[PDB]
Design a protein around this ligand. Structure first.
Ligand code: MG
Ligand code: MG
Ligand code: MG
Ligand code: MG
Ligand code: MG
Ligand code: MG
Ligand code: MG
Ligand code: ZN
Lengths: 134, 122, 104, 39, 135, 50, 103, 84, 58
RNA sequence: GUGGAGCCGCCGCAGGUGCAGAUCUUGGUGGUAGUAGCAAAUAUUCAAACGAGAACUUUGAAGGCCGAAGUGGAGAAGGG
RNA sequence: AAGGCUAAAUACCGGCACGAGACCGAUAGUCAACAAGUACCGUAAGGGAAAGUUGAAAAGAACUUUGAAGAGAGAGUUCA
RNA sequence: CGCGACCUCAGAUCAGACGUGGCGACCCGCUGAAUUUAAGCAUAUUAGUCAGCGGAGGAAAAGAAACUAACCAGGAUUCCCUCAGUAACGGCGAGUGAACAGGGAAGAGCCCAGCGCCGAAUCCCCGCCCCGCGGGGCGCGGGACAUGUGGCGUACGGAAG
RNA sequence: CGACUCUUAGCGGUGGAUCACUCGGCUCGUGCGUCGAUGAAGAACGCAGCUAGCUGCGAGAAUUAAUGUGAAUUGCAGGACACAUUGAUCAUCGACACUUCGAACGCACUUGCGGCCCCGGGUUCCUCCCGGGGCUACGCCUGUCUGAGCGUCGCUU
């Protein structure tokens, strides 16, 4: 149950803060879970997805053992595009059909200098949760 | 050719205005490229040079207002744009010194009869 | 119904002119220029008897009846016929005033 | 445009004559013919 | 006394309100005098005033004023009460001793037409329907 | 009028620039519901009133 | 307008009373605003006693109430004079002073 | 002569736009405005119309400077810069 | 050219002589009804316009 | 049968609680009706061209009109 | 008495932020869920609207064929 | 006749400050109806409200008795519950209409002119410094204010020596 | 026989009710309670690569700097991907800048007409010579400077 008297619980106002989100808050709500292998090597649960992570789709019309990298992150439509899952148009032109990153499992991260520190910050705070158990 | 404002701070005034009027020449001749047919790769150059031309004018104005705030530091009667803004009503309050003033009758009253601390059981 | 639905300039057309004697809005141009204004019939009108915030919302019960009601709510929570007929599956449970020790 | 008399214009207007039809007819009592019925 | 400002003495109302010519203006003439002194000099603060003459048509009051931003006034904490911004235009609000003699306030049985604050603060509190939450 | 002052014809220049249809690249944008300029003024029907 | 055997009544609603209406919806909200103004006043001061100074024994006026004893305002300088404490010392001892009171 | 033919003679303008409110209410001969009453120092507003206040009070413009004052209040109106 | 609307013909005469290095005979301005000022800058007969236009782009 | 994401029974509780009328309000659509009307200021005709298409566009020839207080040629105000 | 200052308990249908509801559900609820004090009206003071919804995803019907085109007939997308 | 002092006043784009205008839910000062009610209508009621005008502040105003009381007496102001639809007002008709006790919420008290005393013991401005950050001073030296009275101690609960 | 008319039913059209939805109101409450001559509220005008409105901004104009954040913005283009430079974008915002009217302030409001002071060049300049800068509203307080009076008086002559 929510106890804080300074955070909402109403349907109209969490939706309004969802679709009118700032574009740096919006990379946080477009987070995706790490794979079972890769959450054990880093002891972290989930990550915000960036442009060049290898990924497979875990639910939808297009799913099942399809590692392949994302190629475009529409934050405006809350949608990542992945380089293999595609769709022919009526024209014969082929386009990327887009999916939501919660329906998606990262299988290989792209590390830079900053995505080391985002991992280590989310990892070091998880021993502190285990250190509460006295 | 990018322009960083952190790089421009160690420059001289005879170098900044020379590099600013240099940028006004490219912004002149890119406007010519828009009134003709067009060279559309140079029609997206116009936005990044007109924001580059604001970065030089900013460092000129920031290293002049603070070059001159160090001049009137330690001075009575500094100009109006160097005085704190704070709102119109803040300038017309007394100050932190005058609001602490107590008259001599109310000073001996406070040192002869100070507020005591106590409690009531025994 | 906040202030009122009475923030409209409107007079009755009054006389003949083959319209009902409801007030009409003033002016011209716009759609809303000869339409029925305030009164509980009109598109955009004011509701009948607009609710007020000084309705008596709260009720008093004298305290001897509040205590009476809570003694009857405890005596029925021990009879197994009444507690099961409210739907609580208490088939497998032991003795109906369930008492666990103060360690819990 | 190539699609502006076809896809701008049929949206542009096409219901703009709808200013009220009638704005009352304030012509002050068309029974100006004095009739007055036997007095 | 004041004449009622109405064209040709015609007040257009009920016969109790034909009062064009015997009307007395419930604030005093000294209070008028302090008012248009603190209205000309809007930077000065007004303390009070006193009587120094009358003829038959004119009446002469000396109004004493205070510059709130002079440092002889903004020092000396026995005078710093009037350089505090709630004392702005004390006669447009009727707060000096000339103007408060017409507010009708004071302690006693003769003055409990104004028994909370002022006359219109009593009226609001004698005429609000104080319906409670449990009633 | 052909004898007009400056604040008239820079008021009239503003009304003349903003009488133009929507560019056709905004119908393709994400989540608009505009489909024609509905603030369009024609010079015989609706007049500015100076 | 009247009817059978009833009460002749004067409802004082002949005046525009719906503007001057007072609803007590903030009244639980102000009860926990002046508890928190008592709690954050108790812990702010000292081990000095809450609810302020010592009040005197005072008898009520006016025939109806003159058989009861009420808490008063101060301590009436004569009583401070006999007890031996000074009039300007007394209000930081925790003792209320009402100089206009007569004994 | 009373009606449609007297509309032809309507040829010269009574009101032009006011410099303080932009209204076409500045009467040329009275030299005053309808809505604001321009050559008076104060603004013309009346409690006998609640809509006319709704059109032109604060909060209906850009608020070029009260946007900033409403923002600077919630930090206590600082003067000196931030640390790096 | 098209000039900023607050420029008189002296400022135009010096701001074309200094930018483009040409002698200016006379200037005839105009407010064209989109709201921008147009200037007609005539050159000295020593110069030519069809080649000065070539080195300013067009 | 259509439709595509929510809903209902019983026991109590609470109402902005059920329409045929108010020359009701708002929106919609009929009969009238393919009707009344497209009738002030004399007038058009032939060929060709352009065109998917010509009583009406342009061109040429004819017959006419306004007839210098013009159905001509310029402006002020107003329009923009 | 005919001079002056003074906190708290009190007020707040404007403002800046919040939180909640036995509230309304697009003729309702703010006039205004939308480019709304907008378009438009009036010389002016002023009056003042109407207007929410494809799909899960544009995948918004390529191509063939009739027509000058609007408009069709096949095909095609889609669970539809 | 000239010069000086002061007293009444002028002028300045003099050095430095200030005020104007907006918002106006709440607050203060003024001003002020009529519809309505009385089954008509004048007084009355509506109402000291609407509209009008002027001033603020985050609160405002009020506030330490020229008070209530009439007895074993209470003790600034403000708010709440009662008093009380009461005393009283009123074509004594329609209607209007407080307060004091009492129970609470909160609680805080002071200063001055006067009368006397102290060699004006007082204040403002300018100049350079003690020495400073984020700038205000107690120190030094000059110009003024001021005896037609600045300052200290004093306030009716008495005060001073 | 056909047609017309009438009533039913299927299908189709017109129309937009109902139902389901809701980035909106509305009520109550809490916390703070902040404009302006250092130029406010409001208005006008302008600003984007294609951009009318809305929204945001002011010739530094769809935003600059700084801090925080850490790869996008996106209708299509274009461009730097550089981040063990400085780093896209977004938020915060304490630094800068902020056209014209407006209490609006040189005077007028007709983008009209000035006055002094200064500066870069032309008569190397006074007596009205281009551009740029500065100043010029009213009321009023303290101080200053200038000085008016058959006001009061002194020292004189
Ligand atoms: Mg909500
Ligand atoms: Mg009851
Ligand atoms: Mg003026
Ligand atoms: Mg304020
Ligand atoms: Mg509808
Ligand atoms: Mg930046
Ligand atoms: Mg100049
Ligand atoms: Zn105006």
């Amino acid at each position: 149950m929510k106890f804080n008297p300074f955070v909402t619980s109403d349907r109209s106002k969490n939706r309004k803060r969802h679709f009118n989100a700032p574009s740096h808050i919006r990379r946080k709500i477009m987070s995706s879970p790490l794979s079972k292998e890769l959450r054990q090597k880093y002891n972290v649960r989930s990550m915000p997805i960036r442009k060049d992570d290898e990924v497979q789709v875990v639910r939808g019309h297009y799913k099942g053992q399809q590692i392949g990298k994302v190629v475009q992150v529409y934050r405006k439509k809350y949608v990542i595009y992945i380089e293999r899952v595609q769709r022919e148009k009526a024209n014969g032109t082929t386009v990327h059909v887009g999916i939501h990153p919660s329906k998606v499992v990262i299988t290989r991260l792209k590390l830079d200098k900053d995505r080391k520190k985002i991992l280590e910050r989310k990892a070091k705070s998880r021993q502190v949760g285990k250190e509460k158990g006295k | 050719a990018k322009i960083k404002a952190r790089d421009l701070r160690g420059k001289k005034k005879e170098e900044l205005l020379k590099q600013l009027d240099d940028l006004k020449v490219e912004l002149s001749q890119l406007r010519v490229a828009k009134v003709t047919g067009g060279a559309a790769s140079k029609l997206s150059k116009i936005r990044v040079v007109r924001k580059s031309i604001a970065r030089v004018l900013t460092v000129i104005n920031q290293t002049q207002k603070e070059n001159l705030r160090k001049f009137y530091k330690g001075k009575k009667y500094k100009p109006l744009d160097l005085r704190p803004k704070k709102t119109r009503a803040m300038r017309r309050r007394l100050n932190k010194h005058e609001e602490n003033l107590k008259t001599k009758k109310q000073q001996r009253k406070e040192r002869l009869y100070p507020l005591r601390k106590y409690a009531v059981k025994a | 119904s906040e202030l009122a639905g009475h923030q409209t300039s409107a007079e009755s057309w009054g006389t003949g002119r083959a319209v009902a004697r409801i007030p009409r809005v003033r002016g011209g141009g716009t759609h809303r220029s000869g339409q029925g204004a305030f009164g509980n019939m009109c598109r955009g009108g004011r509701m009948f008897a607009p609710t007020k915030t000084w309705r008596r919302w709260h009720r008093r019960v004298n305290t001897t009846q509040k205590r009476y009601a809570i003694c009857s709510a405890l005596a029925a929570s021990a009879l197994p016929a009444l507690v099961m007929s409210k739907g609580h599956r208490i088939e497998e449970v032991p003795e109906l005033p369930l008492v666990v020790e103060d360690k819990v | 445009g190539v699609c502006r008399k076809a896809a701008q214009p049929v949206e542009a207007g096409l219901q703009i004559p709808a200013i009220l039809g009638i704005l009352g007819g304030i012509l002050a009592l068309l029974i100006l013919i004095l009739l007055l019925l036997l007095f | 006394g004041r004449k009622r400002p109405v064209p040709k003495g015609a007040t257009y109302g009920k016969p109790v309100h034909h009062g064009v010519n015997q009307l007395k203006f419930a604030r005093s003439l000294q209070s008028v005098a302090e008012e248009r002194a603190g209205r000309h000099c809007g930077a000065l603060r007004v303390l009070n005033s006193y009587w120094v003459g009358e003829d038959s048509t004119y009446k002469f009051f000396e109004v004493i004023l205070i510059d709130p931003f002079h440092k002889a006034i903004r020092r000396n904490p026995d005078t710093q009460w009037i350089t505090k911004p709630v004392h702005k235009h004390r006669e447009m609000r009727g707060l000096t001793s000339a103007g408060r003699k017409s507010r009708g306030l004071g302690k006693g049985h003769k003055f409990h037409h104004t028994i909370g604050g002022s006359r219109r603060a009593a009226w609001r509190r004698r005429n609000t329907l104080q319906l409670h939450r449990y009633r | 009028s052909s004898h007009k002052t400056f604040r008239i014809k820079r008021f009239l220049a503003k009304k003349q620039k903003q009488n133009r249809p929507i560019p056709q690249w905004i119908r393709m944008k994400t989540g608009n519901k505009i489909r024609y300029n509905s603030k369009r003024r024609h010079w015989r029907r609706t007049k500015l009133g100076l | 307008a009247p009817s059978r055997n009833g009460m002749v009544l004067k409802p004082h609603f002949h005046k525009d009373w719906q503007r001057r209406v007072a609803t007590w919806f903030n009244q639980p909200a102000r009860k926990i605003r002046r508890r928190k103004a008592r709690q954050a006043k108790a812990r702010r001061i000292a081990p000095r006693p809450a609810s302020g100074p010592i009040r005197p024994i005072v008898r009520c006026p006016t025939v109806r109430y003159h058989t009861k004893v009420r808490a008063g305002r101060g301590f009436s300088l004569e009583e401070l004079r006999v007890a031996g404490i000074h009039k300007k010392v007394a209000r930081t001892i925790g003792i209320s002073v009402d100089p206009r009171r007569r004994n | 002569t009373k009606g449609t033919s007297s509309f032809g003679k309507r040829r010269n303008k009574t009101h032009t736009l006011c410099r303080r409110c932009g209204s076409k209410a500045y009467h040329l001969q009275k030299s005053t405005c309808g809505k604001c009453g321009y050559p008076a120092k104060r603004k013309r507003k009346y409690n006998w119309s609640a809509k006319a206040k709704r059109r032109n009070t604060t909060g209906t413009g850009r608020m070029r400077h009260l946007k900033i004052v409403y923002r600077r209040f919630r930090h206590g109106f600082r003067e000196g810069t931030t640390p790096k | 050219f098209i000039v900023d609307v607050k420029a008189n013909k002296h400022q135009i005469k010096q701001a074309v002589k200094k930018l483009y290095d040409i002698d200016v005979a006379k200037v005839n301005t105009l407010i064209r009804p989109d709201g921008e000022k147009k200037a007609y800058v005539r050159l000295a007969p020593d110069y030519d316009a069809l080649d000065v236009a070539n080195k300013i782009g067009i």
